[PDB]
Write a protein that binds this DNA or RNA. Structure first.
Ligand SMILES: Nc1nc2c(ncn2[C@@H]2O[C@H](COP(=O)(O)O)[C@@H](OP(=O)(O)OC[C@H]3O[C@@H](n4cnc5c(N)ncnc54)[C@H](O)[C@@H]3O)[C@H]2O)c(=O)[nH]1
Ligand SMILES: [Mn+2]
Length: 1095
DNA sequence: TTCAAAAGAAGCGGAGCTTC
């Protein structure tokens, strides 16, 4: 009751009665919200928020008074104050648009007159804003406090939303657009990553608006109003921004991108401010005024980010104590601007940085259309990073006279998969350009003697930055390779940088000099290396040289290796010992390092081993079809085409096939994580078509530079030796493209057969519009699938071990089955409650359920063990936010458009998510979390998931701790964790209660293709409990292996580069033994440990 | 079926079916 009259005192004039049982118009704003116990927003109570905040922003003194702080961010100066004054005036224009739009709505279809007569329009999907209007003579008007506060939220969102949007990948776009991921057109993914979907824009706006309103949700009010009213407000604000042209709306017709797709999709992009707009130096003034506890802000000095209580976008999952400890540790690290790189970036200038690191200026007619779109996407990313960096620098520069002395902190959160992610799009963790200007690494080195350990550290940092693969060679060999480079190709660049570090000037051909010197080594960190070595050369005191140059301790094929260690469940095999050594687990070799292994024992890493296995599987494939000439020809053409355009595939003069580890890197990784072969085939083809489109721009360029040039020379000039030698390359290309688009392999009854597509590639090539589309793309993909990817998959399995593949399958099925039941039961418990609501006369279809009701439903699922617990991490595989549960609109704008589906936090099918969740989570996730919290945890590093940047002073000890953290994570047992959860599930699940849809989904996972079709609940049930037994057995094995492995002498250098391996000090000595001998000895220990328990 | 975040628009009518 105190709450009712409390919220009424604040909004006494809103239309309707604050009682859900009342007969006439009811006010769902006061029913849905209460005043907080403690102030959240300084606009609560204000009769004119826009006037008050504008006043607050009008001077430093007034701002300080308003926020009740004694001092304001020094970035808030005259120039910035003047810009905010102009932005407040614009807030008035947004407010004015909103008021007119309301008046239009009230007048159309006499909604206002009807509402006044008792028609409950304030409950319509388009009428929820009527809960915040006030009667005004013969009509209605917005409550000014609520209206103007939402506008302030709208201005803040307008300033910073773009910079906080999620990144879209091909997967996201395919889901959005309904177009198969493998067939997405060029630049479509780019078009979609640039804008916001309606849901994306509205939900971020709504969150901000509700935040500024500064109220609390009533647990017993229907979500249709608690979420609905601020969403209706957001929708209206987005619409006003479209009217004001602060936001551009683009309705994308899928019909032209695919004749059969009927979706039309809205894209919303915020009009960018000028890069030199003063407000960029301090874009959060409003947020920091309105909110008592601002979320959008920079953390300078000893202003430390708070620790997140719950997993990112998974509010049902609390960050564990150990996770919070890790977050705290990472949020405490101080970052500092490295002034020389900033000055270098600035002196080069945005345009030359793009020429150097992007695609420079685009001549949209020396470029193939499709290529042109990738180039644009490239520039976008570098340009945004540049602009974002310098906005941050502008704000840092205000904090002090020496920007290199201003400490900077970053907020972090744990993601769904256990990774510690730095919040924001453009920060050191996520943006390479920013990574080289803002660093937590720093050291003072004695470089007066090139025989110091300090100089050796310095060399290692330069080499790694320069794309020398420092983990494949010893420190000594590295040193000689680096010296060769600095005295050879890099010298002209080094000389230029010496000059720059002397006078502060660059030549006009700087881009050329860098580009030529670096060649393929070019990167932002390479620039840091040139900068730092040249700074050392001109340094006055080489004996105390200060530098943020770092060495990254980086995982060697980290995910696959972790999966092999964590989820291989059988006896030990020699192949496993050899392969796992490729990832830094050395048995019976005290103090062995990855550098030594690679140089003296085995130069092939796990990607190369898989690639070599691929070549065998391919050789086998060729045999089974040896007499079938058309099939041999089809394979040769695929191999030929890839050879023309991909560096990783080489065909020799006499036909010798050679493959670089590169083509196996991504396919190995994602295959373990549950990717299908088709998806991989599609990716390989993309890399082929990308290269082709690019070669077409080469044609246009060479052809324009010389109209005489022959087609062959224009397309294979750079790639060939002679004229006629380029004429055969052209012949291969045209033959390959034709056979690969007109003929596809299919698998009928275990055998491959060629079929005509009837849609072969035909016609003269026009290098500008040339596009491999639809039916042609699919054909290329089918060829790639059967003649390359399928043998690759065979190679992968032989490499990582069939035992691991088996474990990931049981893990996948268990977590899928569980997610299906969870999803289905949730939806059912929801439909039950809504049927109870039709009995309620206070309730209307569209109101949905209360939070309290949703909470009770979620709690009722606890006996199905939705959460996986390791003791230090919590995983919620099924957790999601979906439109499928409520299946209805939440709100629209006042024009009956911008219809936002009602989204609910609820479990959904996992699919294959179980694998990467557990592998990433208990692998690199657990390693980094351990690294942050362990005794003697390395200080002043930047952690990037499976690699860690270390200052040059501490590379040895930090690397050793990193490898100890790896070993610690290898004591994990993610299958055991899944088993514990799945066995509780199996004890409580009622398969008979599931919908038939749920039931068949489970059949797919638990039952062979055959026994499905028409199996009973009991067949499903019995099959589901077999998986539990499988899990139990795997988990037992994993546990034994780990204990046995711990008894033996191990050297671990998975976090490689520095050559500082962790020794487990196992007492049983397996040195001077072959992998076969070692496997036998480990299997004895395994059997003996299996008996300790059996008895 | 790789993971790390979801996600059509809009007339009529007042939800939800319909057509593009
Ligand atoms: N889950 C995931 N992680 C990704 C993906 N792309 C990149 N990452 C992570 O970021 C670094 C690279 O950051 P950068 O700014 O230096 O480029 C990357 O390191 P690695 O390339 O060495 O891979 C380490 C482990 O990450 C997982 N992983 C990589 N790539 C993928 C993909 N495509 N899909 C799933 N998982 C991936 C593996 O466990 C790998 O061993 C990553 O740490 C990304 O798309 N997804
Ligand atoms: Mn790595």
């Amino acid at each position: 009751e105190e709450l009712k009259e409390g919220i009424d005192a604040v909004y006494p004039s809103l239309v309707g009665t604050a009682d859900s049982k009342a007969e006439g118009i009811k006010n769902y704003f006061k029913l849905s919200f209460t005043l907080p116990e403690e102030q959240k927003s300084r606009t609560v109570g204000s009769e004119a928020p826009l006037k008050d905040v504008a006043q607050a922003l009008s001077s430093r003194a007034r701002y300080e008074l308003f926020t009740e702080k004694e001092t304001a961010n020094p970035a808030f100066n005259g120039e910035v104050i003047k810009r905010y004054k102009e932005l407040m005036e614009h807030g008035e224009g947004i407010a004015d648009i909103l008021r007119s739009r309301l008046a239009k709505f009230l007048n159309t279809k006499d909604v206002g007159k009807r509402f006044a007569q008792g028609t409950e329009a304030n409950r319509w999907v388009g009428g929820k804003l009527l809960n915040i209007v006030e009667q005004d003579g013969d009509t209605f008007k917005y409550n000014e406090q609520l209206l103007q506060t939402a506008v302030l939220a709208g201005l803040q969102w307008r300033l910073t939303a773009t910079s906080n949007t999620a990144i879209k990948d091909a997967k996201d776009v395919a889901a959005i657009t309904g177009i198969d991921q493998a067939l997405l057109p060029e630049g479509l993914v780019e078009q979609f990553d640039t804008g916001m979907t309606l849901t994306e824009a509205v939900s971020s706006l709504a969150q901000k608006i509700e935040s500024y309103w500064g109220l609390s949700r009533n647990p017993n009010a229907p979500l249709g109003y608690t979420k609905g009213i601020p969403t209706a407000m957001a929708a209206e604000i987005l619409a006003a921004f479209v009217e004001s042209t602060d936001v551009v709306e683009n309705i994308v017709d899928m019909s032209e991108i695919d004749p059969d797709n009927k979706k039309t999709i809205g894209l919303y992009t915020i009009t960018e401010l000028d890069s030199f707009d003063p407000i960029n130096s301090f874009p959060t003034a409003i947020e920091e005024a309105v909110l008592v506890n601002p979320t959008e802000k920079m953390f300078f000095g000893d202003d430390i980010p708070p620790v997140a209580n719950t997993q990112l976008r998974n509010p049902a999952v609390r960050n564990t104590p150990e996770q919070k400890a890790a977050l705290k540790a990472e949020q405490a690290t101080e970052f500092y601007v490295h002034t020389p790189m900033v000055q270098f970036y600035e002196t080069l200038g945005k345009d030359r940085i793009l020429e150097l690191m992007g695609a420079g200026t685009l001549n949209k007619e020396l470029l193939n259309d499709n290529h042109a779109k990738s180039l644009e996407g490239k520039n976008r990313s570098v340009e945004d990073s540049y602009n974002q960096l310098f906005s941050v620098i502008e704000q840092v520069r205000a904090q002090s006279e020496d920007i290199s002395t201003v400490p900077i902190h970053y907020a972090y959160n744990m993601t769904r998969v256990g990774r510690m992610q730095m919040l924001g799009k453009y920060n050191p963790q996520s943006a390479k350009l920013v990574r080289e200007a803002i660093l937590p690494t720093k050291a003072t080195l004695d470089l007066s003697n090139q025989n110091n350990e300090d100089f050796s550290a310095f060399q290692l940092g330069l080499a790694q930055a320069l794309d020398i693969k420092v983990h494949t060679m010893t420190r000594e060999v590295m040193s000689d390779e680096l010296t060769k480079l600095l005295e050879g190709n890099l010298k002209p660049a080094i000389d230029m940088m010496v000059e720059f570090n002397t006078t502060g000037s660059l030549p006009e051909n700087a881009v050329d000099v860098l580009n030529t010197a670096l060649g393929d080594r070019k990167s932002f960190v390479a620039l840091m290396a040139l900068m730092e070595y040249s700074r050392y050369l001109v340094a006055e005191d080489k004996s105390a040289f200060v530098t943020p140059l770092y060495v990254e301790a980086d995982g060697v094929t980290n995910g696959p290796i972790n999966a092999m260690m964590l989820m291989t469940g059988g006896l030990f095999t020699p192949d496993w010992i050899r392969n796992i050594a490729k990832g830094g687990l050395f048995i019976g070799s005290p103090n062995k390092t990855m550098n030594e292994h690679r140089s003296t024992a085995d130069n092939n890493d796990l990607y190369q081993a898989s690639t070599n296995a691929l070549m065998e599987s391919l050789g086998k494939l060729r045999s089974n079809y040896a007499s079938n000439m058309p099939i041999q020809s089809q394979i040769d053409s695929l191999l030929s085409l890839m050879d023309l355009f991909l560096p990783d595939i080489n065909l020799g003069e006499n036909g010798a096939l050679e493959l670089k580890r590169g083509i196996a890197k991504n396919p190995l990784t994602i295959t373990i994580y549950g990717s299908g072969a088709r998806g991989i085939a599609g990716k390989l083809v993309s890399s082929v078509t990308d290269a082709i489109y690019e070669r077409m721009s080469d044609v246009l360029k060479a052809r324009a530079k010389d109209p005489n040039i022959s087609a062959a020379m224009a397309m294979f000039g750079k790639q060939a030796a002679s004229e006629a030698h380029a004429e055969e390359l052209l012949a291969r290309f045209l033959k390959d493209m034709e056979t690969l688009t007109s003929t596809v392999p299919v698998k009928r009854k275990g055998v491959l057969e060629l079929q005509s597509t009837g849609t072969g590639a035909k016609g003269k090539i026009n290098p500008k519009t040339y596009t491999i589309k639809g039916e042609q793309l699919k054909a290329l993909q089918e060829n790639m699938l059967h003649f390359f990817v399928e043998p690759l998959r065979n190679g992968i399995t032989q490499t990582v071990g069939e035992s691991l593949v088996y474990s990931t399958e049981q893990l996948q099925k268990a977590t899928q089955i569980q997610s299906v039941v969870l999803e289905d039961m949730f939806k059912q418990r929801v439909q039950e409650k809504l049927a109870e609501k039709a009995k309620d006369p206070t309730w209307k279809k569209g109101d949905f359920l209360t939070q309290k009701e949703l909470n009770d439903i979620q709690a009722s699922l606890n006996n199905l063990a939705p959460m996986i617990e390791t003791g230090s991490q919590t995983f919620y595989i099924a957790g999601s936010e979906n439109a499928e549960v409520a299946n209805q609109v939440l709100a629209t704008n006042l024009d009956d458009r911008m219809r936002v589906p009602m989204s609910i936090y609820a479990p959904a099918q996992a699919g294959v998510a179980g694998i990467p969740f557990m592998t990433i989570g208990t692998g690199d996730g657990m390693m980094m979390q351990t690294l942050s919290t362990m005794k003697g945890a390395p200080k002043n590093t930047l952690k990037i998931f499976d690699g860690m940047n270390i200052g040059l002073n501490d590379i040895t000890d930090a690397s050793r701790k990193a490898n100890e953290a790896v070993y610690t994570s290898w004591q994990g047992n993610p299958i055991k964790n899944v088993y514990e959860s799945y066995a509780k599930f199996m004890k409580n699940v009622d398969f008979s209660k599931l919908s038939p849809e749920a039931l068949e989904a489970i059949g797919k996972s638990a039952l062979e293709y055959d026994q499905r079709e028409n199996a009973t609940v009991d067949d499903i049930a019995n099959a589901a409990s077999l998986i539990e037994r499988n899990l139990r057995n795997i988990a037992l094995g994993v546990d034994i292996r780990h204990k046995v492995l711990d008894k033996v002498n191990l050297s671990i250098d998975q976090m490689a580069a520095v050559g500082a391996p962790y020794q487990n000090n196992g007492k049983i000595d397996l040195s001077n033994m072959t992998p076969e001998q070692q496997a036998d000895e480990l299997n004895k220990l395994f059997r003996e440990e299996l008996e300790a328990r059996k008895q």
